[PDB]
Amino acid sequence: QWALEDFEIGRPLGKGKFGNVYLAREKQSKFILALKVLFKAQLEKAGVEHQLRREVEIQSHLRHPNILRLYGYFHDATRVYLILEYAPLGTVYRELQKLSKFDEQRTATYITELANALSYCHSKRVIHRDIKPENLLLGSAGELKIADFGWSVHAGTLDYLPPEMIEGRMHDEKVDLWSLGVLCYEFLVGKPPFEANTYQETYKRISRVEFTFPDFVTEGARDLISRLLKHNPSQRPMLREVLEHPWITANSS
């Protein structure tokens, strides 16, 4: 049973369409954490109380070192507050816009941590679906941490969604293997494989699987990425096969 007077709000960690994320500390234990604030009124206009209750339900008792812990929740009359873990080193997003590109060691390392987190999620019949750099945070040691679970369920922005999911078809655990491939590409190139200027256009890119490699992208990476980005959901590797991929094993930590 929590309240809003239990916390001292501080620096804004970022703003979102659902609401803003603020740094906060619990008064009694002096515990530092992230406090996401969402307005109940703007939540009704979107009608996603099922996904917020599902995101809370799913991310609650999910315990993994590469997954952002959801400690608890509460609410006043006006809004709805979520009590999350705090990621000291921030997001991978800003990390990416600062370095522009990632080296193969950082990329392969992130992919590994992400596969461990995904392999843990998949063993519980939980699909993240919405895997993107904006939902990737960093721990005190710089480890990866998957945060948002708004679109998470059991078995918009198109850049990371797979062919089957965008065409309205039936999607399974393999939608994350595609996302995992899209993220790997962006880490090495700095932009998504199917990036465009219009929604209508990116849709064609994804559905036809039209992507090309810049020169500086080695063969090891071109192989892993091409395997993950198959139109056929069954043609994609397992999380086991990904982890034990030559390029991953060679450059990961």
Ligand SMILES: Cc1nn(C)cc1-c1nc2c(-c3cnn(Cc4cccc(C(=O)N5CCN(C)CC5)c4)c3)c(Cl)cnc2[nH]1
């Ligand atoms: C930031 C930050 N800096 N440092 C040192 C730490 C953080 C930090 N953030 C979180 C978050 C968190 C999840 N989503 N957000 C808001 C958000 C989402 C996506 C991107 C940004 C961001 O960094 N932006 C800066 C650049 N502009 C352009 C675009 C926005 C912000 C914050 C959570 Cl849930 C938990 N712990 C955190 N720690």
